[PDB]
Amino acid sequence: AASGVATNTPTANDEEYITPVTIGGTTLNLNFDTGSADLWVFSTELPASQQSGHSVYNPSATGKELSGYTWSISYGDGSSASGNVFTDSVTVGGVTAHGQAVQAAQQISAQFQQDTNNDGLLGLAFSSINTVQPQSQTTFFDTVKSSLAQPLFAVALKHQQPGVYDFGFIDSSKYTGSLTYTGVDNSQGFWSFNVDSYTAGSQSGDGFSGIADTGTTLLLLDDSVVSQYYSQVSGAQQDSNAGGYVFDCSTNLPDFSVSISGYTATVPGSLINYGPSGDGSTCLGGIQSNSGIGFSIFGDIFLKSQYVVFDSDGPQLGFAPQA
């Protein structure tokens, strides 16, 4: 049976986490994203100017083209990408998926043209939301799932330190205590789960649902919760230049926690200080608005505090504090 460990590394301010992935013999640095189901990469089909500062996949060398197939994806921040499709060998942490569908980019929006830290995204949400037309493809995980020792993957994202993606096994040395599991609603293709309640510093409130999403940097919550949280931060104010609420970097931030099937997941205030706002001398808050979409996004700010197991059996998510 198979299993493997892929090491991830955060970019400046933990804005994103990259992990090497070898496709058809070429190694690219991809952003693993549990919030989407497409594996797409910068390729030789892009204009040469857009290939600069990236490792690119050349489909002609090793891929098998799916004639007539296309893909087109649009993300939460409005970014987008589209292209054609090939199958090829894809290796991650020593685990190889043969015949994996690789989505070669032909067009990418400005956000991606500006980000030279990654060469594409590897989706780990459920395959039901893969965008390939006319017939959707399976994610790397769904492709290899049956070959793994256990049909799950786990992740430990860290603050300014390398972390890991464990495929097909759980590394108990990565967390304290035992794991607590909760049921996943995969109906919209996400690793969605419910929280029973939350505590923002001195204020507690009713539960809500949200998605475990490695692809989003911040912890995005309803406007009412964000207000409650920042009302407790002296001098907090919104700064559109920075992207949300900002505050003096030395401010003492309250903790934030959620109750999940009896387990209290706590994000300490120190992790809620994302980093310099870029806006002179303030810091950007790790908690920001979800724009009224009706569910919360448990992004990297939250994930940095926990070891999280994504188990296809159930499905269900397991949580424990990182070691």
Place this chain on the structure above:
Amino acid sequence: AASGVATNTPTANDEEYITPVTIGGTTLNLNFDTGSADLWVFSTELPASQQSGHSVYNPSATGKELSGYTWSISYGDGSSASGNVFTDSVTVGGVTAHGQAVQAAQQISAQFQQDTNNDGLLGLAFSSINTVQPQSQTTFFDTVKSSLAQPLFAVALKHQQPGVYDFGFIDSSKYTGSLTYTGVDNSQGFWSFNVDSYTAGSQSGDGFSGIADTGTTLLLLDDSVVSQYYSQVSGAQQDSNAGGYVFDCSTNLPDFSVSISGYTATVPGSLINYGPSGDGSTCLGGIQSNSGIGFSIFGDIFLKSQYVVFDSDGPQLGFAPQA
């Protein structure tokens, strides 16, 4: 209980079929498409130059915006469209869906900018393939399905004559004999079905699967079948200006038929003559290649010969020769 009848009308050469749909009090002419799951319309959000020669939806007047929601779709011919989302009242043939998600176009590719015959598309494939992010919406049919007398719709597309879309009931006067049903595989979101065999003129061959797709003008089949068919047409030759095989307009074309759960669906040779190729004095064939995608597209050329029932119970498709 509800039911209704919407009249469709073919454009020149039966290239597409339009049907009026009233959204928030404004009537638009839409192309009903059983091959996709999005209801999208030309809107006031498009550049004014692109609104010309169309009836447009103004979301601000009656729609409720789903903040943070987007849609982006890519079709078989490579065309595409994208925009934002609103809920509104949508009436088709006297049947009203309240709170139906209407996808307002913000960008559309050249194919749509050139086609002034329609103001958008109304998808009737399964809702599982609807493109709305972050949470997909239901098609008009799935929205109203529970209110209908029977959870089905039926269609009779005609050659140069008005036809109908029957919602929630079957009009037995539209076909000869009794209906034959066959099981539908909705796993890729299409009204997919299997045929046991086919007969192209003097040649017969093994079965294959395909989708019932009102949104595609032609009958698209595997290259091997297309070759077999045209090898029997004197003087047939490909003409890229025209889009495929063309032949002298007076040529006697062989029939084409498929066996489906014991029923023989026959497309007479006269319907296989699509119309002038635009390429001087030849006619375009109604049968053309599917580009190697692995399944056939039973488009309008085929549908013009049958009354077809799309039944959500099963699901299953019913067929009988048009009356």
